RNA sequence: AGAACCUUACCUGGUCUUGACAUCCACGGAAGUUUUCAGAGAUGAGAAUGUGCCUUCGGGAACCGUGAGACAGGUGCUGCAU
RNA sequence: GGCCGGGAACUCAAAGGAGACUGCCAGUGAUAAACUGGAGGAAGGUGGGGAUGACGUCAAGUCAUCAUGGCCCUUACGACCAGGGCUACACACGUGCUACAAUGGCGCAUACAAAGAGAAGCGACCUCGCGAGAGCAAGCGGACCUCAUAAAGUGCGUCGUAGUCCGGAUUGGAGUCUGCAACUCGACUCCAUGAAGUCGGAAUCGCUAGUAAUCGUGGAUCAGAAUGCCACGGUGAAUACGU
């Protein structure tokens, strides 16, 4: 993982993004490619569509995400068994 | 390769020369521990908005008479079947087949 | 001997006998040893039950045994009820940190499976 | 005087002194047995000294460098060697005989290309 | 002081005639030179595939010698030092003096 | 199967280096593109003229540039107003001072490069084959060199399958390192693909080395 | 192998009693070259054993050598649709070495607590007539006694 | 002789059409530098700053952008044309 | 403290030579080539190892290093960007690595290398951190300085044959570094976890000596990312009657 002296890393498209719609009370998803940014408690109550290579997944973000990538709830392999 | 990734090469190396200077001072307020956290917050949003080309860790080596990707050498800056032919020609000065 | 809620095998040395805690290791059998001052080398069986008090007493600062196993498991099943990556591995039983699953995932994926 | 003998063993260069003396042996500022704990060791280095039956008749001052063990040993056996035969002369022959003037020329073997040692090849599968 | 001439060349022979040319023309003009030592020659080597595809146990084994030959003066008068930096020296030969 | 190289194999025993400055790490690949780009300028340039060998030597804040040439004549000019103008593109290609010496070879049926270069230009101008290696093999063999063995692959007359065919007289040992073989290679473009052309010249064995 | 005759490689007899033999049986217990440890396994055997058995290390390990020794071993040989195992007699220095092979096979099958007490407990067997290696000895010669007849017609 | 991005040739999506990489013609600007907004970025809209070198007095060289077509480009196929 | 004055002997370094040729001797042979043995010699018969690959074979491999005949695309099969993939996973195979242990595991102390690399680099010493590492910062374009106290070994102790103090897979938590960025998908550290495995069916591979076996070390590629490859030493066997 990241170091703690260098903080957490977060895009800023997003942060802007996600400060625009904290501010205005904004209920749509957020759409977004970046899958390396660590949830903030900021987006804490927003939907997030976060890519994972063809659609944008969209993750309602709770308590427990925080620390996390939003990467992580966007799979990005499509499998379904062998047989 | 393709002239495409050869000329990707090009703008990556000046992209780089470009940007070399404010992004080492950035990266050392950035890993500065006497650093207040808000500079070093807002150096890291500096070093997110500056160009991707520009970072030297983005250069891929390349032979300089091919611009192949794979099986390059530092010391020539060539790839490996152009250091043979040159090699061979006898156009690098000093090298020959050995044995011991 | 009884510390924790388990019995440490007497006829071997402290440190090896007290790693027989799920939780405790080597290293943090030595801590315990180092600050209950007694040696490593003494068997169980060979030492004062005023000396097991306080192993027991320096014990229990270490969540462990029964309270560690609930802590790993809530700490799985806030992966698996999370949805994330790791919980999906978790819950497929494929392995979690990026090893390679085309051969070699003997362990997370149990014995062979015969088509 | 002090005869010089030079042995090499692999990768070891030894530099032995000869002077007639009481039987000391001293090797790098150490003893025989503080330097060479290999017993056999310290039987290669007074292999030369045991068929001229002359043990405690020389002190032996001994430089060595570079190899490990046997390969000091041997250089040094073979510098004693070189060193008896600089004092005497007359110990040629014996000493050629127990096959102690010839220096082993034995080195490690180079790592070739596509071979995993010397001569090891990979693992072959025909299908 | 003392001058310091190092001398680095990938054929020794080229290097031999640059170091007798620069002992001789120390010995002819008013000076003398300790000797030049022979330094370890660095080879570097190279192992390079030869087939332009697959065929990885085919392989070339390259090697440059860089030969190194360092050689004193103890007394540097008022005219050596002129002479060394205005002689000229092989195409392929670097000479480096430090003061 | 795959020979070695016999100017490569003999580079520091019979054969001269054709780059002769020193580098260190810092300054080898600029170098060596910077011989590369002079080369082949050198090369496109003149074409024309008969170059064989272009030597090249790096002093200190210098180049000198030796183009050993069969016409000296065409390659420097009247009075010397090209040689002029090629020191000064390759100066301000190298990114040196340039001082370009013109050697002269005086047989030109004997130099290797030479050789496969007039079979090339035959080959490109549409002459049989046969025709221009006997004709390349016998003059070498009647103006001294002591063998010559000329190879001549791939769609031979614009024939759809690939050939090699190859003549050769008197000598040519390409396992005796000691031996004066003078290896060169040329490509000829022909309508139907590439005609590769390898020339061995055998000069007669070298006794002494290098400083010979 | 087919042309070239192979010269023989000279070996130092060990330190401790000058002999040659017990070099070769240190080399043969020897496992990826460390002689040291392998040389301080048959020092602490021999002292064990001899301590043990009250003659000296070379006597007793010279009858502990006399009683796995073979003298006949059978070969394998095809003989149309079936299989002739062969008796011929061996010469000393194999006799030598199949003796130290079945000393130290028959001591790393054993079940004691180090290699020296293996390796003492199967010479102080051999001595006494008796064990794994023995019991090898004499299935070699079972088989060489019963299938001599074939020996017999291939002289 | 080393796929996190790059490499990368593959997929999804957003973009460009003389083009990312050249030479040639015409026109206009020295290039360069600092900075704002929007966008995932490609990109688009700006703001402020700079006007250098050599001739000659007419313009050039370097570099950038626009427009047209000669083309550029292809890790597309055939190693059973080479 | 080669630490200092010193010395040029030695080790060593790197140039030039010498030496090894069946050259000498004795038998066998067809008055031959040659073979066998011996002496001398450091090396003896090709001293060891490498480089060196004949005419051709397989329409063998490579059009994706490059070059190139022809064919195909040209607001797309070209070009740029973000994210993903190349890392998937009921399975099958090849090549490795680590093991199943006592010829060992562990703890303390201690001995002996060879080759190589280094300036957008190798980075001491000191301080801090359990550690990965951080801060300050010397030297070094290097026989100088750094990477970099080699490991197996040796000595003492302990474990006592148990799935163990063997093994170290997997997983949770806490971190470090590099890089814009470590979720997919990096290496490493710490703490906890402690999987299979007790020597492997039919079958099959390497190797004739400094070899096999094992034990460390370095390099290229490389911002980071080796159990691979290339190279380097340490210890160091067994066996070849014979075709
Ligand atoms: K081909
Ligand atoms: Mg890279
Ligand atoms: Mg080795
Ligand atoms: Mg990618
Ligand atoms: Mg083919
Ligand atoms: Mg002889
Ligand atoms: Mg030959
Ligand atoms: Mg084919
Ligand atoms: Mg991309
Ligand atoms: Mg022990
Ligand atoms: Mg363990
Ligand atoms: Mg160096
Ligand atoms: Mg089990």
Known sequence: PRSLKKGPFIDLHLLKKVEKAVESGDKKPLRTWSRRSTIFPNMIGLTIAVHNGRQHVPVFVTDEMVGHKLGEFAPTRTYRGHA | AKQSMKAREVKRVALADKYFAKRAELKAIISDVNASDEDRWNAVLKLQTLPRDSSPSRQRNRCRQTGRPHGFLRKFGLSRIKVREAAMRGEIPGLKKASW | ?115 | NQYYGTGRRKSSAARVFIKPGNGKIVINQRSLEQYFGRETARMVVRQPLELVDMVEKLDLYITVKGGGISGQAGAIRHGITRALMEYDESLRSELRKAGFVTRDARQVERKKVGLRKARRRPQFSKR | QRIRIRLKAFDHRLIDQATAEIVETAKRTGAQVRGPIPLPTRKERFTVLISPHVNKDARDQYEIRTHLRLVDIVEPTEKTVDALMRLDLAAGVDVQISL | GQKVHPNGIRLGIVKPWNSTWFANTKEFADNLDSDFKVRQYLTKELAKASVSRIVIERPAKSIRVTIHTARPGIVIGKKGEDVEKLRKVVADIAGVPAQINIAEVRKPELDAKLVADSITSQLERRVMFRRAMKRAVQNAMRLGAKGIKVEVSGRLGGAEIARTEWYREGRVPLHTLRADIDYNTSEAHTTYGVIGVKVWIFKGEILGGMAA | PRRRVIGQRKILPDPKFGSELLAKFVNILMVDGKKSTAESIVYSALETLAQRSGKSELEAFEVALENVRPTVEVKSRRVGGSTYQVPVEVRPVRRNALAMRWIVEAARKRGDKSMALRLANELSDAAENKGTAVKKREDVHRMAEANKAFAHYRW
């Open chain 3, 1 to 115: 001997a009884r510390i924790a809620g388990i019995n440490i095998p007497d006829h071997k040395h402290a440190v090896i006998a007290l790693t027989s805690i799920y939780g405790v290791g080597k290293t943090r059998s030595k801590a315990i040893l180092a600050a209950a001052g007694i040696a490593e080398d003494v068997k169980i069986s060979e030492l004062s039950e005023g000396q097991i008090d306080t192993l027991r007493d320096e014990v229990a600062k270490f969540v462990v045994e029964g309270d560690l196993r609930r802590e790993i498991s809530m700490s799985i099943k806030r992966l698996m009820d999370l949805g994330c990556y790791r919980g999906l591995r978790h819950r497929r039983g494929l392995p979690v940190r990026g090893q390679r699953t085309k051969t070699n995932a003997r362990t997370r994926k149990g014995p062979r499976k015969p088509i």
